[PDB]
Structure 1
Amino acid sequence: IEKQMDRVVKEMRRQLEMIDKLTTREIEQVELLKRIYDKLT
């Protein structure tokens, strides 16, 4: 069981990195939206 819980920890850390990559993309999308809005106005 000990070995399965270690695998789980590794996988959660992996998912965090994936969510991090999402967050960077969201930050990009927001700035691009803001720039698009500025253009319009």
Structure 2
Amino acid sequence: IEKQMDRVVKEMRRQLEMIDKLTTREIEQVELLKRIYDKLTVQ
């Protein structure tokens, strides 16, 4: 089962890269949302 075990490890590494993408894009999104909100509110 060491072959399948290796597949699992490779999939997890692939999953991580995807989670990192989601994590960084989320940050950009919320930061943009806050700016948009500010453009529509009294300052």
TM-score normalised by length of structure 2: 0.86
1-structure distance, mates of 2:2, 2:36: 51
- Structure 2 Cα separation of the partners of residues 27 and 5 of structure 1: 33
Extract structure 1 runs of 4+ deviating beyond 6 A: none
| RMSD of Structure 2 on Structure 1 (CA) | 0.7
Structure 1: 5+ residue stretches without partners: none
Give me the whole-angstrom Cα distance separating, in 2, the residues matched to 1:35 and 1:26.
Answer: 14
The structure with the largest helix share of the pair is 1
Q: Percent identity?
A: 100
Structure with max Cα Rg: 2
Structure 2 residues without counterparts, runs of 5 or longer: none
